[PDB]
Each structure stands twice: as C-alpha cells, then as structure tokens.
Design a binder for these strands. Structure first.
Lengths: 159, 138, 204, 35
RNA sequence: GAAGGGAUAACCGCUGAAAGCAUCUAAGCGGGAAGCCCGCCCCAAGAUGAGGCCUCCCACGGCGUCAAGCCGGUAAGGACC
RNA sequence: AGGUUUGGCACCUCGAUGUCGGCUCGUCGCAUCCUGGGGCUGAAGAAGGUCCCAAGGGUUGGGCUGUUCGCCCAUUAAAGCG
C-alpha cells in the first residue's frame, strides 16, 4: 500500500497516507508492528479472550489502511413528497414531512455530498465517523410506513 | 516483676503515594502505619504513630469495575432519603475522600481512632503544601 | 447580575392601554459600591453595596473608608451581589429599563409562634359533633412501635414569619430615576420600609 | 418481548443477546422476544 | 414547577472479532426518560476539619519552680439601665 | 415469590399490649391508576391490545349504609393496589 505510512507505538497505531493520519489504539499486548512490505499481528495464548481480542485488531488497523487509501462511501435514498435535501455548504437540510425542515450539522473530518434531491452519500475517512453518521441521517425518517416514505441506505426494503 | 513503657516520643511523619495501588490494599498499610503498629514501642492507649501524608491522590486503581458498582450510601439525611453516591462521582467531584473513607474503616472506633484519623493527611496532588519534613516512605 | 439594595415603600396601581396593574413601589437609592472581591482576593466575585446615607460617625473601628464612596458608611449596611461588578462608583438605578424581570428578596413579616394550620394550613378538627378540645390541633404525628418516633421533619407549630423570602420574575413596570424609584408586580415580601434587594430574573 | 421456554420461532429469529437480557429475534416483530 | 449542562433505564444504533460469513459487545463509540446528578429556593463553619475577606485596638505595671495556674487599669469595642 | 385474606401453632404480653369505622397527620413499597420513555402487534391513520423501563408528582365531589367494601350520580389525565 505504497501510499501508506504505518507508525507503531506502545499500544496505539498512527497510520498515515494520501488522506491522513489516524489513531488506532489497541491492547498493550502482542507488540505487533510492521513486519515486511506489509503489516502483521500475532497473539499469545489461545484463550477465547485473546483470539477475540486478536483478529479484532487484524481488521482494526487494516481499516486505517484502506481508510487513507481513499475510504469514503455511505449512500442514502428518499421517496414521497418534499423528501429531499439542499446541500448548505458542508452540511445539509433535508425535509421530510416534518413541519420544520431538518438542518444536519456538518461533522468535522466528514464530508457531505448532495448528488441530487433524492440519492445522498456521506464521504469521509474513518467509520466511527461515517457510521455514527448513519444515525445522523436515517434517524430522520423510518422505513416500513408500508414503504416509500423515509430515507434508506443502498440495501433493500421489506413489505 | 517488670514493666515496659515509652516516654513522650516525637511524631516522625511520612509522605507517601502509590497511586499505582489499590486503595485498601494501600489504605490498610497506611492505617497500620497510623497507629504505631510497626514501631516496637507499642501502647494502644497512648496515641503514638506516624503522621502519614498521602499526595497525588486518586490515580488509584481499584480492581474490577466500580462504575457505579461501588456505592457510597454513607449519607442518611433524616426525613426519607439515604443519598447514595457511586465512585465516579467522588473521583470527579472532589476525590481524596475515596481514600480517606478507606482509612477510617480501618482505624479503631474510639476517640483515639478518631484522633488517629486526625493524623492522616490526604490531598489530590501531587503537592502537599503543608510539610516541613516529608520522609517519603516506599 | 445587576445588584441594588432598596426598600419596600408601599404600593398602588397604574394603567396600561386600558388595564389596571398592581405595582409595589420599591425605593432603591444610589448604592455607593464600597468593596469588590476578585477570585485572587476573596474567591467569589461580588460587590459590597451601601445604602441609608447619613451617619454621625457611629462607624467606630470598621471605618473602612478606604474607598472614596465612604460618604459616611450607610448604616443601612452593605450586602454583596454575588456576581456583579459595574463601574465602581454608585450603582445608579437606571440599571433597569421597563419590561425587565427581577428577583426581589426581602424579610417575610414576623408572624410569631404560628400555630400549625396557619404555619401549614392543616385540617384542624370538627367545630362540632366530635370532641371540642382538639379543634385546632395537628391530630396524630406518628405510628406505633415501628418506627417508634417522630420523623425528622414533621410540620409542627412554630416560629413562622420574619424570614428570607425570594419572589421571582416580577415585571419591572415604571422606573423614576428622577426621585429614584422602582415599580413592579406587588408580590414583594416584608413590611413597608424594608431592606429589599432587587436582582435580575432567572427565566433566562 | 417474552420470558421463557423458546426454541427460536424462525431462523430469522436469531438470539440477540446484549447488555444482560437474552432477547432473541428475527426480522419479524412477531418472531421477536426478550428474556 | 422551568430553561439549559451532565450521566443513565428499557431500548434504538456505528465499528467489530472470537466464529474467513453475521452481532449493538467481548476491547471501542453514539443517541435514550415526569426519572438520576447539577442547576431555581431556603438553612447552614459546633463543617473541633470550627472556613475566607475588609477595617480597627495595641505592650508586663508585679508575684514562685516562670507564659499565669495571679491580680491591678486598659484599648478598640461590648454589656447594664 | 410475597406475607394483603382465610386458617394452623400457642413463643412474649392476663400485678391489663383499649380490638371496627370515620377524622387529623402522614411516610414507605412497586407488583404502575394517571402523567415520562420503549419493543412487539393479527400496528395503514385516529383507537386499541400486550410486554418492558420508570413512582417526580398526581390520584375529585356527592347518594345509600357504622361500615371497610361495593353499587350507583356527576366528572376525570387518572379517579392505583399494599
């Protein structure tokens, strides 16, 4: 991942790249650093405690990687009447039935992209930032009001 | 016939802090210290012992979880309420006590243990702006 | 938190558009500020105002005239204003523009040893039928063996009155900086000629 | 949304065990439970 | 009565192993109540852990084994009436 | 499971522990009658049904009976149980 700069410390990991550096704090166990032209992770015991705590990081870091290497995505939908949004700078204001339009605060490190009035996506480097920003959204409208209304992801609805 | 009595000693203090310790596991040793239980010139009726001083309060580990698991009922106003308080609170809202209490329930119940608790001097330091002879013990 | 000592003086009513208003006439007066208390100093952060002027050197040792305002310490004593700190040189009165809401504080009139059911609007007892000696009486006060005592709060006959009262959100009607006055919504504790201290509502 | 002797209505009714409560549930709010 | 802060219940979620899939959970993180803690009001330093600040009054005159355990006048102030 | 009913036993009290009901004054419990949240629904909406958090605060006035209780009248967010 040539664009990556994997820094290692006691129990934390600073991953740098074309996008930015991030903190991936982990357990003071393993002292797993960067072995080879890539990154590895080991463990001590075979205790359900470690195995679980292990691998968990295998992924963890692995994301700081893909993250800097252009990690964005987070698409949304709509449907109905005034169910749409008009990007106001870095934040948006989508309206949905509510007698008062909704102004969604613009999170830092996270970018809001309004492709159209309907479809919408959240762009940014992380997850805890993006996903947490799935609430900031879907939380506006539900789903099964015998469908149509409400915003969605990219997945599919159920009657 | 025999006898074994000590004259008027001279309070030899002690400055201390092992915030890397578990209060209690520590407190005891502090209490043990308080009353002259280590110094071989015993007299449970006298009131001679270290003037123990603990700095760098809190920072104290505390085994398993006391995230509201450790409650401090301690307070019973009088009309209908027995105000309870979890650890987290004391830590944030003025700690020190955390350890203080741990010491009280280790010092004897009389006006003495009452007097001995008067010796203990804990602060949320580091910094014990109150000494002229800190003999930091390990 | 705009302070200002003052004294209740009575009350009447005025009009507006076409509706009558109950107004109590407070009389705050120029309050020679005579002390401050910065966190570096005392630790709070307030202002020691002063009131009733004239005073034939009955100041003795606490002359504390180390502030021009001295003007002969106003025996009507001084009382801070928790978080106030204006241009130290007499707190005007024009501190309040009409339509503002204050939180007046004063001393409730002393009702002496008040009887329960006056002190607590208790029921009392039949003025007929049943007995005749327990008319005004608190009835029972406890239970039996358990708990076996009176609660540490039971309301009982007692000294009631002459106390610290604080009525809130009183609308400031008119303000006569001329003769130095203040008008509000009647509900202000204490007899006329009382040490009352006007503040600023906490509705916000 | 329940309390005893369950065999897992439908497979969708996966046992969701969190905090302390053992509430198993499918996609179906009818096939939903909570110990 | 409240605004408003903070921490939570049930519960709603993001990331995510153990278990290559998947899960709100195990390490992690968000939102969540007339409720909880802090706010509003009142008491309150007998809080012997006896707090803080501002301004005042100022020297032993004489008695053992020397800090009074003893008196004779004060001061600033304080009571009496 | 709880100790609110009806009972069993006969341990303290027979040189005495006044025993229904009302009134007055209440305080506590949650197994919640309202008012706060929430999951399901054979939930379109408005209603409901059920289970889960949660007592901060509420929890009316009359007719009949000594009544507690009930049944009625008129309301209510509700007219909670112990």
């Amino acid at each position: 991942p040539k664009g990556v700069s994997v820094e290692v410390a006691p129990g934390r990991v600073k991953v740098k790249g074309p996008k930015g550096e991030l903190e991936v704090p982990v357990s003071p166990e393993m002292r797993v650093v960067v072995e080879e032209g890539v990154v590895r992770v080991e463990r001590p015991s075979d205790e359900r405690r470690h195995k679980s705590l292990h691998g968990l990081t295998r992924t963890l870091i692995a994301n700081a990687v893909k993250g800097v290497s252009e990690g964005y995505s987070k698409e949304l939908l709509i449907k109905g009447i005034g169910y749409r949004a008009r990007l106001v700078g870095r934040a948006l204001e989508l309206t949905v039935g509510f007698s008062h339009p909704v102004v969604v605060e613009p999170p830092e490190g996270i970018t809001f992209e309004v492709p159209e009035p309907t479809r919408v996506r959240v762009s940014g480097i992380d997850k805890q930032k993006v996903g947490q920003v799935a609430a900031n959204i879907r939380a506006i409208r539900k789903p099964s009001a015998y469908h149509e209304k409400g915003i969605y992801y990219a997945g599919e609805p159920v009657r | 016939m025999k006898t074994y009595v000590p004259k008027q000693v001279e309070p030899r203090w002690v400055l201390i802090d092992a915030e890397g310790k578990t209060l209690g596991r520590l407190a005891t040793k502090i209490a043990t210290l308080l009353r002259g239980k280590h110094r071989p010139d015993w007299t449970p009726n006298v009131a001679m012992g270290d003037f123990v001083v603990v700095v760098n309060a809190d920072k104290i580990r505390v085994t398993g979880k006391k995230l509201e698991q450790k409650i401090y009922t301690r307070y019973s106003g009088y009309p209908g309420g027995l105000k309870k308080i979890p650890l987290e609170k004391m830590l944030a809202t003025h700690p020190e006590r955390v350890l203080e209490h741990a010491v009280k329930g280790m010092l004897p119940k009389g006006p003495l243990g009452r007097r001995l608790f008067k010796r203990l001097k804990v602060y949320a330091g580091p910094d014990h702006p109150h000494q002229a002879q800190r003999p930091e013990k390990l | 938190m705009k302070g200002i000592l003052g004294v209740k003086v009575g009350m009447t009513r005025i009009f507006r558009d076409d509706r009558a208003v109950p107004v109590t006439v407070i009389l705050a007066g120029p309050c020679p500020v005579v002390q401050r208390r910065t966190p570096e100093k005392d630790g709070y952060t307030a202002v020691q105002l002063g009131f009733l002027p004239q005073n034939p050197k009955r100041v003795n040792r606490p002359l504390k005239g180390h502030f021009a305002k001295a003007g002969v310490e106003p025996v009507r004593i001084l009382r801070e204003i928790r978080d106030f700190n204006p241009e130290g040189d007499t707190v005007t009165v024009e501190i309040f523009k009409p339509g503002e809401r204050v939180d007046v504080t004063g001393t409730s009139k002393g009702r002496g040893f008040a009887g329960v059911m006056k002190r607590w609007n208790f029921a009392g007892g039949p003025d007929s039928h049943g007995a005749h000696k327990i008319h005004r009486h608190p009835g029972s006060i406890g239970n039996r063996k358990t708990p076996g005592r009176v609660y540490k709060g039971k309301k009982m006959a007692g000294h009631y009155g002459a106390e610290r009262v604080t009525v809130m959100n009183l609308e400031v009607v008119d303000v006569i900086p001329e003769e130095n006055l203040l008008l509000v919504k009647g509900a202000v504790p204490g007899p006329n000629g009382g040490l009352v201290i006007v503040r600023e509502t906490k509705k916000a | 949304k329940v309390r005893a002797s369950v065999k897992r209505i439908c497979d969708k009714c996966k046992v969701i065990r969190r905090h302390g409560r053992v509430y198993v549930i499918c996609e179906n709010p009818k096939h939903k439970q909570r110990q």
